[PDB]
């Protein structure tokens, strides 16, 4: 998985979901008066409305990532082997990992409010069902000022980090992931100087040689570096159409192509989908692996005061434009 | 530029066109009875029909790449500084670089016929006009057996190479480009073995670590290695829709994103378009940088006995699908 | 800087010193009854003898690294910008960075005893003098069982790490440095399998292609990975001569060559020297940049009950052997 | 194997010999009136004196590398699978690959003289003895002007190349080996500039980060790049002691450590010795894997008009200096 906030003019937040199998995701809008039930907290009977990609299990939205009507966004990305969910604490809001996105996006409008709410939270070891055991996740949270932060629940407790580069992938823990970027200071959009020796003729035989050491791999660290390079060198435009086009080139640059990340016999982790929300306008965009026409769901064209889930199918089939 | 042949069941040939500035291009079917004129050879009054993308002129089809009705495909890719075109030779067929595709694709059906014609050819230093100086190219040729061939006109003469990997980018010369692949034997879709030492605990901390050393750069050798890894590990499917989807994932895996390959002040080489032809069926497909919905032009739906160029606009503007 | 413990049979501990300027340093044995004086603690009037390379100033051994007579070793490696030394603390033993090696090596014989002393230490922001401001260092400590730990004094306090690979270089902090090794699991002494695709003919055109992605750089992470690869694939022998021979190949594999690491105009960081001590025997070995004949100083041939520093020159000029004479 | 000419003031030519088995080589001075016998040419009864490392096979010097009294040096380096030796030719001096060094260094004093002799040569497929096949080699040749050239005998003929970097290792052919240097222009002794993006704070956390991408491997291409970086950034001094010290630091920077290049079960290729000769002065220097004190043999202190080989044992055992 890869998640970014991209702030050329308006602010766009979203992620690639990298898994080996698709099973029942939809675009889900949760309106303000849908009651969020919590295992160990009183229900949120009214809350901010939100939109994202989710499973719908027994009428409950298990969000992979979402954005609320105040321009606050949040995404849960795989964090295998690192994620720890804790015992219940008598002095904290005990919130399950699968309840984390509704808890936060339903109650908070800014990063500062997120931090305040997190000062009272305990991400607790609670499973949705015996069938659906909890996934191992860490979270990227960003708001429409362009500020972002990272939440990791490690063995020695929960850690919260300001995110100066506004990107997140998977393992390792954010301090190591962020520091690894320092090793790529010389990766450049421009041709290199001959620093090797002026007594040797270095021929600039290919445009693009500046990025010769850009990681191309499917792994977590390679995608973090690659998405950071793409994000901070992408062009800035004035229109919505241009900036969302650029946004999807950023995420598609770290797409996991089928066959390249093999996790088992004929089993391949790949980018199921790419989404992005205009945090300033509440507009949800997505592409899928097989359908890279941009699909648009406008949260503001729904009745956000209603009390039941609003669902749209993810258009995940190849759609061709036949010019005859 | 990157060009491949991809042979899952049917055979698909095409390329990314990477340039820092466009002047327009278009899809062009040249029918059988469009007379091909040649500066130094008699005209081909009748020939095979072909389809590809050319410059936005209707004087003459100046193809970037094309595929004829017999399943033979050919693409010219930037070869900066290496490409040498020769003085006219009395005992050869003197053919301009911009006449190469019509000359070959107009008369040849197989790689074997291509080689016979190439043995008597001389790629002459002729310009389409005094203003339109010939660009520096080398060529990938492939037919529907999956066999392919590289043509390079260097300063010491024309060299013709069998291509065992069916890929081509830009510099250097093909023996160096092909040999460089030997350095990436251990790049893997599966998790790496701990070869370092069984006394060191190596944590397989991220899926995709097998490809940690896959090159991600925008440069010529990086894209050659990366597209070969993508092509030979791409899944094999049974439907046309699935295999052409896969084909565009291979080409998009070596797309040059705007901003990442700087050739001058605010001037960036980027992937203008990606195209692919089903050599077996005569069906032409393309995406462009800003419109990655796949566009289809079926050559067999046209009057191939016509005498006039048949043209279609390249739809290069972002197409959104609004769902609510 | 690069420091290792190498444990083929006996145990060998030491380091490359990577700096841009030398002058002053000697092989220095501090005997049992040389009185170690401390700015904020009572003097150690008698203590374990030790041997190492030191800058002697005002009759005080400013050790770069040393090993004591009980087979405990300790080295201070550059930690630029990372090292933080603290205000004096009540309820702690306040010890200056330049007194750290005498404090530990004078009093401890084992890692377990080192850990006891560290639980009550505080590395204080104290300078040798106005002209000698304290260096930014972190420390590798190893004993003759082959166990080692790392001490790093960061902005948010002192951290002590068990060291499973027995190697240290410079920045970054040890958890990041140790975790970076995970990126090199596929580096191999053996020819690589063709994982790329069995549809592509990968020619095995050179021996050694298994190590094609081994880092060769002069930088701290590169050297950490390269020294670990060298150490864990080095052969093990049953002889002192062979095992110390191997030891210096490990250290020399990560030598910084003059001209390859420029830290300012006409100023280059390079490996001044490599040393190694046999912890089980008390034998100090070293080479220098211009003299890679192994020089030997046996601490046990000196009077370890004396009270004065005992010094030997670092033989740092090239000594050619004319076979033709 | 790695071979260089290093030209700080005087000129130093030599090599690392990288093999898995030591045989029993020694330092051999061949005086002017030792008769060189050839299988298919008249004997060379008087010739230039030379010094180098040789096997000894009943009175015949089989040099790995040598340098003659006129300052011409030559080294045979493994070229596995690539070396082709030819059928005898009726119009050429047919010289065995193991006769090549005596043939050249016996009669030539300069690179230009070498090039004239090579115009009449045919490196023929002659083995030294029934159960000792010829080894597969290519050669680096250099003289006291600093100039060097490469001789490679490939399937399609002998190829001679001027060597602009004065370096050679093993496979592949020299054109590909040399061109690969272009991929390392940015490898630097100096700290890198932040070209990734100035919106990203890149910490220059370690001295030497400029060489972060210097290859460290044991393989042929890695050592070629690494010895070149070491050679052209090595300091230049006024005296012999200083320059020969620098010279061995260059060769030792590409030493293959035991255990790092496994060629078979419990069998490793390693640097058996490093040697260099002062071309201007005829002084021979060497280290061995286990003895890094520089050993010196002055060819000119011997009787160069003699008729018998003059042999010295290689001091290959560790010799310690006990200071107390």
Numbering used by the authors:
A (entry chain D), B (entry chain A), D (entry chain B): 2 to 325
C (entry chain C): 2 to 326
In the authors' words:
Bile salt hydrolases (BSHs) comprise a diverse family of microbial enzymes that catalyse critical BA transformation. Primary conjugated BAs synthesized in the liver, such as the tauro- and glycoconjugates of cholic acid (TCA, GCA), are deconjugated by BSHs to generate cholic acid (CA) (BA names and abbreviations are summarized in Supplementary Fig. 1). We found that Lactobacillaceae BSHs display a clear bias for either glycine or taurine-conjugated BAs.
To examine the molecular foundations of BSH substrate specificity, we determined the crystal structures of six of the Lactobacillaceae BSHs examined above: four glycine-preferring (LgasBSHb, LaciBSHa, LingBSH, LreuBSH) and two taurine-preferring (LgasBSHa, LjohBSHc) BSHs. We examined the sequences of these loops and found that taurine-preferring enzymes exclusively contained G-V/T-G (‘G-X-G’) motifs, while glycine-preferring enzymes solely contained S-R-G/S (‘S-R-X’) motifs. The glycine-preferring enzyme clade containing LaciBSHa, LcriBSHa and LcriBSHb exhibits the highest activity.
